[PDB]
Structures are given as structure tokens and as C-alpha cells.
Design an enzyme around this catalytic site. Structure first.
Site, PDB file in Angstrom:
ATOM      1  N   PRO D  15      15.845  61.694  49.372  1.00  0.00           N
ATOM      2  CA  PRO D  15      15.862  62.292  48.048  1.00  0.00           C
ATOM      3  C   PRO D  15      16.770  61.707  46.979  1.00  0.00           C
ATOM      4  O   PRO D  15      17.794  61.105  47.210  1.00  0.00           O
ATOM      5  CB  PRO D  15      16.176  63.737  48.334  1.00  0.00           C
ATOM      6  N   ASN D  16      16.321  61.869  45.749  1.00  0.00           N
ATOM      7  CA  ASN D  16      16.977  61.333  44.601  1.00  0.00           C
ATOM      8  C   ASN D  16      17.079  59.801  44.479  1.00  0.00           C
ATOM      9  O   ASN D  16      17.535  59.267  43.465  1.00  0.00           O
ATOM     10  CB  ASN D  16      18.352  61.975  44.437  1.00  0.00           C
ATOM     11  N   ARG D  23      21.718  56.176  37.144  1.00  0.00           N
ATOM     12  CA  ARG D  23      22.794  57.154  37.131  1.00  0.00           C
ATOM     13  C   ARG D  23      23.870  56.777  38.136  1.00  0.00           C
ATOM     14  O   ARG D  23      23.581  56.187  39.179  1.00  0.00           O
ATOM     15  CB  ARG D  23      22.252  58.526  37.501  1.00  0.00           C
ATOM     16  N   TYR D  28      26.205  53.896  42.918  1.00  0.00           N
ATOM     17  CA  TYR D  28      24.977  53.388  43.493  1.00  0.00           C
ATOM     18  C   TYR D  28      24.524  52.039  42.984  1.00  0.00           C
ATOM     19  O   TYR D  28      23.616  51.423  43.547  1.00  0.00           O
ATOM     20  CB  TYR D  28      23.877  54.409  43.312  1.00  0.00           C
ATOM     21  N   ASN D  79      17.440  55.253  54.774  1.00  0.00           N
ATOM     22  CA  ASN D  79      18.506  55.779  53.947  1.00  0.00           C
ATOM     23  C   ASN D  79      18.091  57.190  53.672  1.00  0.00           C
ATOM     24  O   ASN D  79      17.313  57.426  52.758  1.00  0.00           O
ATOM     25  CB  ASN D  79      18.643  55.048  52.681  1.00  0.00           C
ATOM     26  N   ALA D  82      20.608  62.573  51.101  1.00  0.00           N
ATOM     27  CA  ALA D  82      21.229  63.897  51.327  1.00  0.00           C
ATOM     28  C   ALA D  82      20.855  64.464  52.645  1.00  0.00           C
ATOM     29  O   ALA D  82      21.690  65.080  53.304  1.00  0.00           O
ATOM     30  CB  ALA D  82      20.891  64.795  50.282  1.00  0.00           C
ATOM     31  N   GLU D 104      20.279  52.729  60.048  1.00  0.00           N
ATOM     32  CA  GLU D 104      20.613  53.675  59.006  1.00  0.00           C
ATOM     33  C   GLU D 104      21.403  52.971  57.937  1.00  0.00           C
ATOM     34  O   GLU D 104      22.342  52.301  58.269  1.00  0.00           O
ATOM     35  CB  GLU D 104      21.530  54.765  59.589  1.00  0.00           C
ATOM     36  N   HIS D 106      23.392  53.188  54.012  1.00  0.00           N
ATOM     37  CA  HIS D 106      23.902  53.966  52.881  1.00  0.00           C
ATOM     38  C   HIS D 106      24.464  52.992  51.912  1.00  0.00           C
ATOM     39  O   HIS D 106      25.196  52.104  52.308  1.00  0.00           O
ATOM     40  CB  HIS D 106      24.999  54.942  53.315  1.00  0.00           C
ATOM     41  N   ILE D 107      24.102  53.156  50.652  1.00  0.00           N
ATOM     42  CA  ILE D 107      24.529  52.261  49.617  1.00  0.00           C
ATOM     43  C   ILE D 107      26.007  52.440  49.361  1.00  0.00           C
ATOM     44  O   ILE D 107      26.794  51.422  49.283  1.00  0.00           O
ATOM     45  CB  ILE D 107      23.726  52.580  48.334  1.00  0.00           C
ATOM     46  N   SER D 108      26.413  53.716  49.217  1.00  0.00           N
ATOM     47  CA  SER D 108      27.812  54.053  48.949  1.00  0.00           C
ATOM     48  C   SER D 108      28.511  54.167  50.272  1.00  0.00           C
ATOM     49  O   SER D 108      27.875  54.408  51.291  1.00  0.00           O
ATOM     50  CB  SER D 108      27.920  55.413  48.223  1.00  0.00           C
ATOM     51  N   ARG D 113      33.880  59.646  50.258  1.00  0.00           N
ATOM     52  CA  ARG D 113      33.415  60.664  49.348  1.00  0.00           C
ATOM     53  C   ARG D 113      33.748  62.034  49.898  1.00  0.00           C
ATOM     54  O   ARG D 113      34.645  62.158  50.706  1.00  0.00           O
ATOM     55  CB  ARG D 113      31.917  60.444  49.086  1.00  0.00           C
ATOM     56  N   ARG D 117      29.963  64.643  53.193  1.00  0.00           N
ATOM     57  CA  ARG D 117      29.183  63.421  53.369  1.00  0.00           C
ATOM     58  C   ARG D 117      29.656  62.540  54.570  1.00  0.00           C
ATOM     59  O   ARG D 117      29.024  61.541  54.869  1.00  0.00           O
ATOM     60  CB  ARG D 117      29.201  62.567  52.128  1.00  0.00           C
TER      61      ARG D 117
HETATM   62  O1  LIG Z   1      22.967  55.495  49.871  1.00  0.00           O
HETATM   63  C1  LIG Z   1      23.813  56.488  49.896  1.00  0.00           C
HETATM   64  O2  LIG Z   1      25.067  56.243  49.528  1.00  0.00           O
HETATM   65  C2  LIG Z   1      23.382  57.888  50.261  1.00  0.00           C
HETATM   66  O3  LIG Z   1      22.626  57.823  51.496  1.00  0.00           O
HETATM   67  C3  LIG Z   1      22.649  58.398  49.223  1.00  0.00           C
HETATM   68  C4  LIG Z   1      22.764  59.689  48.744  1.00  0.00           C
HETATM   69  F1  LIG Z   1      21.915  60.022  47.804  1.00  0.00           F
HETATM   70  C5  LIG Z   1      23.683  60.672  49.162  1.00  0.00           C
HETATM   71  O4  LIG Z   1      23.055  61.933  49.225  1.00  0.00           O
HETATM   72  C6  LIG Z   1      24.267  60.253  50.503  1.00  0.00           C
HETATM   73  O5  LIG Z   1      25.447  60.985  50.766  1.00  0.00           O
HETATM   74  C7  LIG Z   1      24.598  58.785  50.430  1.00  0.00           C
END
Ligand SMILES: O=C(O)[C@]1(O)C=C(F)[C@@H](O)[C@H](O)C1
Ligand SMILES: O=C(O)[C@]1(O)C=C(F)[C@@H](O)[C@H](O)C1
Ligand SMILES: O=C(O)[C@]1(O)C=C(F)[C@@H](O)[C@H](O)C1
Ligand SMILES: O=C(O)[C@]1(O)C=C(F)[C@@H](O)[C@H](O)C1
Ligand SMILES: O=C(O)[C@]1(O)C=C(F)[C@@H](O)[C@H](O)C1
Ligand SMILES: O=C(O)[C@]1(O)C=C(F)[C@@H](O)[C@H](O)C1
Ligand SMILES: O=C(O)[C@]1(O)C=C(F)[C@@H](O)[C@H](O)C1
Ligand SMILES: O=C(O)[C@]1(O)C=C(F)[C@@H](O)[C@H](O)C1
Ligand SMILES: O=C(O)[C@]1(O)C=C(F)[C@@H](O)[C@H](O)C1
Ligand SMILES: O=C(O)[C@]1(O)C=C(F)[C@@H](O)[C@H](O)C1
Ligand SMILES: O=C(O)[C@]1(O)C=C(F)[C@@H](O)[C@H](O)C1
Ligand SMILES: O=C(O)[C@]1(O)C=C(F)[C@@H](O)[C@H](O)C1
Lengths: 150, 150, 150, 150, 150, 150, 150, 150, 150, 150, 150, 150
Positions: D15-16, D23, D28, D79, D82, D104, D106-108, D113, D117
Site C-alpha cells: 500500500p501507498n 511525497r 522514499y 515490499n 505497511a 523482502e 524496504h526502501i527506507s 523509524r 515499524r
Molecule cells: O519501503 C519501505 O520503506 C516501506 O516498506 C514502505 C512503507 F510504505 C512503510 O509502510 C513501511 O514501514 C516501509
């Protein structure tokens, strides 16, 4: 590995269950322990087996009876009652019943009661756990033993 | 308050259960979801009732179906699967089914698995909870609804 | 940065709220969701604005609608209901609405209910949080958006 | 067990992420999801493979896609965004992918954080986990899948 | 059970609020306590009522004033400030106000601040809780009292 | 701010890694540390850089080496091994490397092991963290440094 | 921003300190509060300043005196005693003293006593904290204020 | 029991302090370790004593130095830096210094930083603890040792 | 060490107790504070003593009164009410009453109420604790003081 | 797999133990480290073996010595002292000693001391753990190694 | 509902109390269990009643005796000793004594001892709890039963 | 204070140990309880003493036997088995054995098993604790008692 035909199902009841059907009916119902026994006798007979139905308020006695079941019975249906939440001893006794089917039964739905009733040491060993189905849970227990012992 | 004769029992299954009997048999067994449905159809017919058996991977769809059950079914047997441990939404949907019998079923004995599986939101509302009796637990579920709806 | 005059206020409602006013009135009251919508339409009109009122039982759909709001609405009044307690997804969607006023509303006073309702992921982002003011809290929400969007 | 040559790599985005590069760039970055897909296509082509790149805001749909991957793809780079922190359902869906490589991403750097998370359900099943390497992490993911599928 | 017409609304303010509008404006804003009182006087007048607006830095004096409100006022809007997080005494005082409407108000959004501010003892008794709506939250508070006292 | 061309990448390895490829292969694999160094030398050369590869069982020596990297190297790839979970000292040493890119690498997937391994002090400072990608994670690390130092 | 020359140093003492030197000498010593004040007067004189030494058993009164210090004093040395561990109100009062130097003193070494004394709310705001240096810690306090106010 | 006249004060500094005054000045200031030594030498001389000032990044070496202090010095001023939070070994070494005055110093106010810095093993043994008084805290340390050794 | 004959028993009552017998009778009963005083006067007279019965809503005032008791009374019976759960200051004041008998009394059985009422700071110092004996507990308190002071 | 006859038993001692018998005798006794060595030499000789007795204050040095043991000794008796409670590094070194008998020894009964001493990382790997048997525990350690190496 | 005149007060004592007055006098005093019985006999006789005083080291036997009390006694004064902290079974037995007054007594002040003694399962059901009043607590217990049974 | 010559060593074995050597050999081994007794008899005879070896599944019976040991035995070697983790009653019985040497033995290494086995109530009183040395730990126990009783 005894079958329903060679050996009875041991049905063990823990503390305070001798007073079943005489207090907190809304929680435990109005059937007595003798009513439960009869239910168990009938459920087992339908599969060609028998039961050995016992109740004690003593932890150590419950342990002794589990040791007896390892040699003489085909499975155990147990409602450890309060000891469910505190007896590592009953857990270790059941752990010695290698290969013996064990089903844990609770009349009330413990997950809706006080937090200290949420946990059961027995559940770590029991093959199946039935909670909140009233005394009918005992029948479920006999039936699952019948299927596993089969 | 519909009876087993006026309305079917809704049997809900949560995520990943569509793959029952094709993975982790030692945990979930080798019966498929279709095998389960047939067990449930049979158990209900013996009491004169019917079932409406569904499976979804979407939390919101399980919620919609619970809403439907409030108006059209006589009880719910639910295996929420993974949503058991995370979905307050399903708990709240069940909380709107005032007076409707609900039985929670789990094939595996969640109490022997990872700690995050130890807790279920549904258990707070369910009349009965059956865990670790294999697919046979669905039958117990149907049977308890019959006795409650009776 | 749209004003109340250029764009409606998006009012989002989460799961089970479609049954508002038909269950647990002592908790949620006896007004329906349609009654709430009307309250919101009226409160907004007094400031010269409009509303776009929605309800869903699906987390992902709430997320989609939040994305829509970022482009087309002047603020969000949200009652995420059960998802308040579980959805990091909705929090992150609201975190993308940079500069957009968000007010969280809860009909019931969550702080007096079960401990798992005490925490809300949305409250970390929301500009304001209103709880336990009944459906009147929705009006407060619309009013705060009007003052912030102003 | 399909090879990079017989089947594509499924790249799943939660999501997102559809709003990537619009944003919170400091978190990100400013590349978009389409930029990521292109990076992935290139990385895979260097090893002779292809990718099937998807994004969804719906937990259940991600689950469906994971089921599809078990039958038709050679690995999964995911990825979950959330849902990393909340979805036992995705975990269990991945647990059905016996033998299939999962990485798996994750960008961040989630460890820097908010505490909620810090934990990921997916990490328990993923063969590898890459965090805080920006979108370059997706390439690492494709690369590790190439080496494992090899 | 006094009405807005028979008795004022008591507005209580806890410690440090005497310095409102002179420090940490980004948190508490730049309006003074006197500005707040004027807002409350106006909001109440629109419903035909009056207010009795007080501030103290002493827990025991707040408690005394709550006692007074039970006999002489029609409701309480309270911003207990720091004592929100530490005073069981104020809670118990409010618990003696049987039938009297209480609304808790926080200017800042406590849920975004330090963890020790996340919990309020008063929230367990208060009918409604408003946080992070700035000084406008006081108006909400008067309005909710008007509707309950009505 | 040295570039890959002006200064080598420091690759630090913590305790017990001198025995890599001689124990617990299923966890750490069968490559030796010398095999890893060669992988690193190659990855770096492709970008025009060099590496300074070190291993120590002493916390304080790792710290000393971090201080040397601040003055003479272009980035740090570190597998702190056991010190990942206990050494605030290494964290602070890295916190003095202002502007220097740091990537944390773990051969095994720590998130699948004992709970005490689930946390890493280094992750709070590291730009990126790679876990469970075997010794290939070291290459990922070199590559990220190349892209950041660039 | 007053200097040691324009304004006195406020020395605040919390509850029970009026009995200093008459009980638990092994913990608090045998000097009295008057002895402490004299030490403070001497320490400040050596820098050309003065002190305003106060003690109270009332939280709110300590809060009122902090408000006074913001307008009239050049810094605060505070021993909040029991309120150290419970008073969010004193914390928030100190937070309003923007730019004013604050040093927290404890006579005893709180870290060696009961666990509830291990935490202090005041320490989050205080520029410096001195514990377990006996009454000599007050001198340290005055000295640090001199240096900061300078 | 040596006096300030018979034996020097040992001033121990833990890891990363060799870089004092070259990084994070806002936290640690811009004085160097040499500047601190000079402050200490001066403070001690005013009481007729001397100092032995050391820094190490190795836990075990700090331990060895503590052993040496038991035989040859009159007290210890120690800033264990990161080992404050992790080293039971330094605590136990200090616990062998029966009767020797120990004062713990931290330049920064650890109580305002990350939670893992809030706790110090050394504080359980230290006679006094000074935190957040900048490098001036070292002078307070020397001064307390002088008064205790006296 | 005054005897029941030389000095009265101080009976202290904390916040909200001035309302005893006018609210929550099922919890606190219907006797008033004046009724309690009379019971105390009688119980003491039977042993040849007198009482000094006080109530306050102010923590600091309770502290002051405890100080007075150290010099002028033979023991303390105390119902700290809400401050039982929050006041380290009252504990510390009682800790200065070396040798003085202290009995803590609670009308309600705090162990059956909200979790925050399960802990009492006073209990750590009180010689005896009586809870849930209604107002009769005050008589038990006077009687224990008589036997200890004897 | 060396036998007591082919290779010595390595006896490792952690920090501060060099001072055994010179401090805290009530805790550690009055025997010195040399006295323990002699006890170990004697115990081992009775079985036909020898010992290699070492002490260090450096974690990394203990690790190195563990690596040496893997190649050259027949078992390890270790008293890691303070590192027992902090060193994941020593645990992992011992984990590399596949098949090598390890016995952990503590002179004092750690379970009766501070909570942080209750836990040991070494105990997870050790075959046997002996605590609170004084120096005699070292003999028990040698004896167990003899029986396992046999 | 028997009165003091129709039925005795059952006084139950749990494990190890048979040794009262022979060990840890500073904690339990020097009176024996027979001394306690005599105090109880006298206290009851003053109200026209009798007592049935028993001691056991067996949990289950306490449970049996509680069952007996439901039918034959007018109230229970119980000192469950160690079982206070561990026996859910005694709690549930007391829970069956609907309407029967129960007072829990502890000789020592458990709140000042080890943390595991701070909690009692019996306290959740007991009408009253008396702790740390020495053996005189038993008298308080009889007296409260007399007043409630009346 | 009886010597090995005046009185036997009591060896107590808790629940389920009657089945030693017939289940879970990998954990408990294949020696029986009778084998253990014989080891103990032999170890004691070498020092001129005798043993009194007992096993029970009943907590209360263990307590009774501990009482007996106080008067008639020279020390106690105890393996409380499951009661180790639950019985405050056995701890307190041991606490009455003032001056009597107690050694706690566990055959398995409890620190490697389930978390609830990690804690033992008996360890707080026991002079020595031996875990994971197989049945040889009983010999250690007898030997330590011989040395202490000496
Ligand atoms: O790519 C990331 O950093 C992540 O998977 C992305 C999101 F949108 C967050 O909801 C995650 O905590 C991190
Ligand atoms: O059958 C039951 O519901 C139970 O096992 C019986 C008891 F008596 C309780 O102690 C358990 O909590 C539940
Ligand atoms: O039936 C079960 O065992 C379960 O409900 C099904 C799942 F799929 C899991 O997610 C639950 O943890 C168990
Ligand atoms: O409006 C509310 O009170 C709420 O958000 C609605 C729900 F349905 C619940 O899931 C929330 O806990 C409260
Ligand atoms: O109005 C508020 O936001 C608050 O109640 C006021 C204060 F003064 C703080 O102490 C509270 O945490 C928040
Ligand atoms: O590379 C790894 O997987 C690790 O960093 C290495 C070790 F040696 C362990 O101590 C860490 O927990 C993991
Ligand atoms: O000065 C002190 O050591 C202290 O601040 C004073 C008190 F009175 C205690 O309540 C504090 O805990 C410590
Ligand atoms: O002086 C200090 O603030 C400190 O002791 C020094 C360090 F380097 C940190 O590791 C400590 O947390 C603080
Ligand atoms: O007498 C009591 O029960 C109590 O001490 C009085 C109060 F007012 C409450 O605050 C306490 O929790 C209980
Ligand atoms: O042998 C011991 O008792 C110990 O291992 C030695 C030390 F020095 C301590 O650090 C351990 O806690 C105990
Ligand atoms: O009377 C007592 O103080 C107690 O009930 C008696 C014991 F024996 C202990 O086990 C309890 O903790 C307290
Ligand atoms: O001897 C043992 O290892 C043990 O004490 C014996 C048992 F039976 C278990 O109940 C204990 O946890 C371990």
C-alpha cells in the site's frame, strides 16, 4: 497403543468440578458431574468403548492418575480446571504419555474470563483443545479420542 | 433467531484456506476445503439443516458476509485463520450478531505454535472455540450450533 | 490547499458503521449513518461547504479514498472504526496528505472500553481527535476542518 | 522450481507505494514506481529473466497474487509496506510457497523509524531482507533471486 | 440535574495554563486564557447559559472545585493539564459527580507527544474527550455539555 | 568525502567470522572469509575502487578501526557479528563518521533466529542493512557504497 | 536573560527537605537545610551573585515559584525531592522557562535506591543533573548556573 | 585509603572520547580531551593533588586500569561512555575498590537521549553521578573526590 | 515514643473522603466521615487514648500533618485515598517517622478494583495494612496502634 | 574429539577473577585463583588428565582462547564472570566448538543476586551449569568433563 | 447463611504455619499456632460463637475444607500462606462460597517482601484483607466475620 | 547441625521422576531413579554418611518431608522437578531450615528449555544449584553437602 476396544478412555476432572451444577450455572451450567459422566459413557459406547471417569482436587493425585493412564488407557480427556493455569506438573506428566491422545476440555470459554485463565500449560501438549462448548465439549473430547485411537 | 430448519449455518473460512490439503499436511492435514465442506454438509443434514460454506482472503468480505449472516443464517462456524490474530473488524462484526451462536474453529493447535498465534480476537465473542481437532473440529462446530440453535 | 468553497470535505467511515443505530445503542446510539450524514451536510452548509460521505468495510478501499481526497477535497473527517486500532496502512495514507487537515472521530469513548481500543494509529497523524461525543462529534469534526481550511 | 528462464520474478508492492516519488522524498526518494519497475526489468534481463511487477493497497489481493506466484513464477521480491507490520496473512501465504525464494525489500531503513515499524512478519519467512538501500534495494532483490533460482 | 439555565458550566483549567499564549505557541497557540474564557462565554450564551471559568496549579484545589460543581453547576469542561496524567485524585472527585456531564479537553494532541502524555486518568470518567483542536476544543466542550444537559 | 577513487572501502568483520566456512554451513555457508574478501575486491574493482578488508574479535579494535576509516576511507561495509547486538560503542563510533556511508551486513537472517539477535544497535546509524543474502550481501554492500559515495 | 548580577539564583527544595539533617543521616547527611542555604549563599557570592532559597511540601506552590523565577531570577537549582518522580506539573512549569538554566540536584544517589526513584521527570528538561554528591551538589549546581548564566 | 597528597586521582575516559571536540559539538562541546585534562590538572592542584588521566576504547583495559587504581590512587573520576550502558565488567571492577571514592561523569545529559542511554551500570556503585554539566562536570568530579578523600 | 496516654492517635484521611456516605455506598458504605470519627473516638477511649482526626484533599497538607505527628502523636492511622497510589511524598514523610507505628486503612478492597489501585506507596512503610473491612477497618487500625504503642 | 589423555582441559576465567580471595570473601570466598588452579590440577590428575588454566579481563581474548580450545583441548570449564551476562560473542565462540564439552561455573549463586546476573548467555550452549558451589564448583566442572570426554 | 450462633467460624491456615513461632520470629513473631487458636477462640466467644481451626500443607486439602465450610460454617478467616501467591484452585473454591464472608489474613506485611508475594489470588474474592498486623490480624478477621455474619 | 556421621542426607525428588529412564532419554537419560539412588548411596558412603532417598508427586508431601529433614537430617539435595517453577510452598519450607545446607539439582539444563523452566523458586534459598550435569549432578550435590556439613 491400545484401542477403544482394549482399554477405556480416562476422563479426568480437576478441582472444584465435584460441585458442578450447584454454583455459577450461568458459567458452568446446571448439569452435575454425574450427568457429564453419563454423557461420556454414552458417547463412548457408540464407538464400542468405555470410560473411566475421575475427579480430584489434588494435583499430585491427578499426576498419579495420568501415569496410570499411560499403561492402562487408550486416551485422556482432561478438564484440569484451575490447575490448567498453574500446573507444570500435570504438563510434564502428560508429556510422558508418548503417543497417547490427549484432549483438553473447558466448560466455560476461558478466553472471556480473567486474564490469568487465558493461559493453559496443558494446551502445549494436548492434541486438541475445546473451550466454551459447555458439557457437550466432553462429548467432543470422547469423539476426537475415538478418531485418533482408531 | 432462526432455527436449523429455517436457515442455513454459515461456515466461514479465512485466508489461505483455499489451499487446504496441498501444503503443510503435518499441520493442516491432507483433506481439502471441498472435503471439509462435505463433512459439514453431512453433519448438518443429520440434524435437519443446511450449510452455506464460503472462503475468502479479504477481511472486508468476511465482514460483509458476517453482516449477511445476521439476517439470513442460524449460526456461524468460523475459521478466521490469520485474521484471528489481527482483525478487530471481524470481532466487531460478530459483536453485532446479537444472540447468534458463533463457534470458532482452528484445525491446528494454535497454542503450540508461534506466540503471535496464541491470541485470537474472535475468541472474546465466540460461544465456543475448538482448536487442534483437525477438520473434525468443523463437525464439532456444526454440532454445537445445532444444539444452541435448538 | 483547497478551501471549503472549492472542494468538499470527505467524511470517511470504517467497518461495521453501516449498522449504526441498529445495535449496541447504549454504545453507539440510535441514530443511523444516514442521520449522521445529514448532520454533516448541515454543519458544512453553514460554512458554505459540502461533504462527500462514505462508508466501507475494506481497509484498502479506505486507502484508495484517502488518495482521492488528497487531490480533490479540502479535509478529512474520519472514523476508522476497528481499523483505528490495526491499520498502519491508513496511517501511511494519511501521512501522504501533506498539509490536508484531518480530524479523527470516535462515537464511543474508546478509553473506557477494552485495552486494545485505547490505541489508535490514526491519532499520530490527525490534527484533532474527538471521542465519546456521540454523533455530535462528527459536527465538531466538520467545524474544525472549516476553521483550519479557512 | 522454475528458473529465471522458465518463469518471471514476481515483484510485489504494497500500500501507498503507488505514490512513490511524490511525497516524503527524503524518506522514499524521488523515483517513481515506474522508475523502479524499469530498474527491475533491466536487472532481470541481465540474467536472462523477466519480471511481473504489481502494486496493490489490498491485503487480500496481495495474498491472491502470492498464490499465483506459487504456480507461475520463479521467486518473489516483496515490499509489503505497511502490511509488513500487520499482516499475518501475507506471512502465511508466503509460507505456502515451499521452496520458492523470497526477498523482502524496504526502501527506507525501518529500524530508524517508529518502533512499530521495527518488526516485520514477513522477515520470518523471507530468505533475505534488504532495508534502507533506496530503490537500489529492489535490484539487490532481483539479483539474489537470480542466484538462488539458479 | 441542573440545566444550562439554572446553573453555570464550570470550566476548569489545570497547571501552567495561566501562561497560555506566552510560550510554545506552536503547541498551545497564541491565544491567552482570557481569550479562551471569552470564547466559552459566547459559546455558552448562544445556548442560554453561563460559565464559571477557573484555573489552578494545585491538585487539591481542583478537587475542591469539582466538589463545588456537584452542587452548583450543570456540567464540567476540564483541561486538567499535567494532572491528566498523574492525578487519581481528580478522577475520583469526578467519579462522585454522578449524573453530571464531564468533557475533557486538551489543546494539544497528546497522542503525538511524549508517551507519558498518552494516558489520562480523567478519560476513564469523562463522557467526551477532545484533543488537538486548539482552543476551539473548549467550544466543542461547551456545546457537548449543552446537548447533554439539555 | 572521499570517492571510491581516492580512498578504499573499509570492510569490517566482527568476532568469530575468522571461522567462516568451517562451522554451521547451513547458517553461514561454506565460503571462507578469504572467499568473501575476493568477492569484495572484485565488486569494488568494477566501480574503480579498492577495499581494505579486516576482521577482529575485539570490540575496541573495531572501534579504533572505525576512527581510522573516518579519515582515510570512503565508506564502511560492516558485519559486526555478535557485537551487533551488544555494542553501543561501535554505534557511537559510527556516529562520529559524519557523512560517511555505512552499510550493515549479516550473512544469516537474524530475524529468524534467537530473539536477542533481532535487535542491532548498528542499524540505527547504518544507511542500509542487508540480512540473509549470504555472502552475496557483502557485494550488495559494496555496491551501495559505490552509489552513495558517487 | 538576567545575569548573576541582575537577579538571584532561585534554589528550590521539594517535600520533606525541611527535615534535612534530622533523619536518615546515612542517606541525607547531618547538615540541615539552613546549612545548605549558607553553602549556597557563599558559593554564589564568590561569583558576585545572590540566592533566593525556598522549600515547600506543595507541588503547586513549587509550580508558582517556578513561574516567578521566569520573570525574576537568573537560573534555578532544584531538588524536587519526591516530586521528581511524580510531577509532570513541575516538568511543564520548567518547560515554560525558555532559555533559563536549570540544574537538578539530588543529595542521595537515587540510582542505588528503590526502582521508582530511578526516574525523574525533571531530568528531561534540566540542563544538568547532579546526584549523590551530598549537599556539596548544591554548590555544584550554583556553579554551573554561574557558568551558564555568564 | 590514600589522600590527595599521597596519590593521584585517576580520571578514566571510555570509548570514542579521544575524539572529543571534533564531532557533535552541540552534544559534547568543542573542548578537546586535552582541554579536559588541563581542567582537571588545575582543579586538583588547587587542593594539593595530582591526576593521572587516561582514555581507552577497550573495556578490558579500563578494567585493568581500575585494578591499578585500587592500589595506587586516591579516587576515580570516570566517564565510561558507551560502556556505561553495557559493561557489567566495569561495575564489578569498581565493586572491588572497597572504600575508594568513585564519581561518574557524563558530559551530555543522558536522560534526554535515547532510552538505552538512560541506564548506567556504573551508577549502582558510584558515590556520585554528574550528568550534562559539560566538561565542567569533570571539575565537579575532582572536587567531590577531594572532599571525600579528605 | 509517646504512649496512648501521653499523646493522641492521628487519624488522617486523604482526598474525597469528606464525601463519605454520600456517593458510591455499595463501595464505601453509607456512614459519614463524622460517623467514622465517632467510631475512632470510642475505640481509642477503651484503651485510654484520644484521637486527632483530620481530612484533606491536599497532598502537601497531609505531608505537613505527618510532620506534626512525628513530634506530637503516638501513631498514625492513615487512609491516603487516591494519594495511596501516586504519592511518593507521603511515603517519604512517613519514612521520617522513625519508630512511630503506622497503619494504612482502605474502606474498599482495592485488590478488586482497577489495576492502578492495586499498588500503594504507603504499604511499603506501613506496619499494617487493612483493606475492605469497611469503616470497621479504622477500628482495627486504632486497636493495632494501641497494641504497638503499648 | 580428544580424550583427557590426549589433550588438556581448558579452564577459562573471566574478568576480575584475578582478584579472587582478596575482596568480597563472603561472596567469593578467601581462596585465590592460584588455589583454584591447584584444585583443578588435582581433580584432573585423578582422571589422568591435565589442565590449562587461564584468566583474562578481555572479552576478545577469551574468544581467541576458545578458538584455540577447539583445536587443542578436550573440554572447557568456564567461569565467564561478568561477560556471562553480556557477551553474545563468547556464546557464539562456544557455539563453534561442535562436540566439545563445556561446563559453565559460577562461584557465587547468581540467582540470589541482582536481577541482571540471573541471566547467562553461556548457559544456552553449556552442557552443564554449576552455581554457588564455591570454588568446589570448578572440581565438579572438571569431573563432568572427564565423564563426557570419556 | 448461618449465624455465629448456628455454626462455627472456620479458620484455615496454609503451608508451613505449623511451624509458627519457631523460625523467623522477626517476620512471623514468637507466638505459636496454638497461641493463635486460643486468641481466635476468645475473640469468637465474646460474640457468642466458636471456631474450627485447621492447618494443612496440602492445597487440595484446603480446597476440600473450603467445600465443607460452605455447608457447615458461618464464615472463613484464611491465611493461605504460600498458596496465596500460586493457587487459583483455592480462589475458585472460595468462589463457590456464595454469600459466605471471607477474610484473608497475613501475619507479615507481604507488600514489603519479595515481589512474588505482592500478589494474592485470594484477595480477588476476599471481602477483607488484613496484612502485617501480626497474629492480632486473626482477631480482626474474627471480628469482621462477626459483624458481617450478624 | 548434624554431621554426615550423625544423620543422613535427605535426597528429595519431585513429580514425574518416578519415571526416570523410561521416557525422553535424550533429555533425562536412561538411568532409572533406582540407579540414581545407588549413585547417591555410594557417593555418600565415601564420606562416611548415608542417604534417605525419596520421591513424590505431591507438593504437600515434599513440604512435610522438608519439615522432617529439619529435625533429622544433615542436609538436603533436592530435585523439585516441575515444582521448581511453581512452588512458593517448597521455598518457604526450605526457608525454615535455618543453617541446613541445601543443594538444588536438575538433570536437564533448564536454561535451554522452555522459558517457564528458566526460573526456579528454590534457587533463591539453595546454597548451590547444579543443572544439566545428568544424574552425575546428584553426586555433586552429595559432595557439596559433605563439604558444608563438615
Ligand atoms: O519501503 C519501505 O520503506 C516501506 O516498506 C514502505 C512503507 F510504505 C512503510 O509502510 C513501511 O514501514 C516501509
Ligand atoms: O471447565 C472449565 O471451564 C475450567 O477448566 C474449570 C475451572 F474450574 C476453572 O478453574 C478454569 O478456569 C476453567
Ligand atoms: O485453522 C487454523 O489452524 C488457522 O486458523 C488457520 C490459519 F491459516 C492460521 O493463520 C491460524 O494461525 C490457524
Ligand atoms: O466510533 C467509534 O466509537 C469506533 O471508532 C467505532 C468502532 F466500530 C470501533 O471499532 C472503534 O473501537 C470505535
Ligand atoms: O491542553 C493540553 O494540551 C494539556 O492538557 C495541557 C498541558 F499543559 C499538558 O500538561 C498536557 O499534557 C496537555
Ligand atoms: O552474519 C551474521 O549472520 C551475523 O552478523 C554474524 C554472527 F556471528 C552473529 O553473531 C550475528 O548474530 C549474525
Ligand atoms: O535529594 C534527594 O536525594 C532526593 O531528591 C530527595 C528526596 F526526598 C527523595 O524523595 C528523592 O527521591 C531524592
Ligand atoms: O559523556 C557522555 O555524555 C557519555 O558518557 C559519553 C558517550 F560517548 C556516550 O556513549 C554516553 O552515553 C554518554
Ligand atoms: O478507603 C479507600 O478504599 C481508598 O483508600 C479511598 C479512595 F478514595 C480511593 O482512592 C482508594 O483507591 C481506596
Ligand atoms: O563466579 C561468579 O560467581 C561470577 O561468575 C563471577 C563474577 F565476577 C560475576 O560477574 C558473575 O556475576 C558471577
Ligand atoms: O502470614 C503471612 O505473612 C503469609 O501468609 C505466610 C506465609 F507463609 C507466606 O508464604 C506468605 O507470603 C505470607
Ligand atoms: O531434573 C530436571 O531436569 C527437572 O528439574 C525435572 C523436571 F521434571 C522438570 O519438571 C524440570 O523443569 C526439570
Amino acid at each position: 497403543p491400545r484401542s477403544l476396544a482394549n482399554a477405556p478412555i480416562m476422563i479426568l476432572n480437576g478441582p472444584n468440578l465435584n460441585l458442578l451444577g450447584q454454583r455459577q450455572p450461568e458459567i458452568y451450567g446446571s448439569d452435575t458431574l454425574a450427568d457429564v459422566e453419563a454423557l461420556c459413557v454414552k458417547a463412548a459406547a457408540a464407538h464400542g468403548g468405555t470410560v473411566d471417569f475421575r475427579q480430584s482436587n489434588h494435583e499430585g493425585e491427578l499426576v498419579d492418575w495420568i501415569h496410570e493412564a499411560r499403561l492402562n488407557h487408550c486416551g485422556i480427556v482432561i478438564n484440569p480446571a484451575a490447575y490448567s493455569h498453574t500446573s507444570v506438573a500435570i504438563l510434564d506428566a502428560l508429556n510422558t504419555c508418548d503417543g497417547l491422545p490427549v484432549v483438553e476440555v473447558h466448560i466455560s470459554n476461558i478466553h472471556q474470563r480473567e486474564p490469568f485463565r487465558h493461559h493453559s500449560y496443558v494446551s502445549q501438549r494436548a492434541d486438541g483443545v475445546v473451550a466454551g462448548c459447555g458439557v457437550q465439549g466432553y462429548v467432543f473430547g470422547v469423539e476426537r479420542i475415538a478418531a485418533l485411537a482408531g
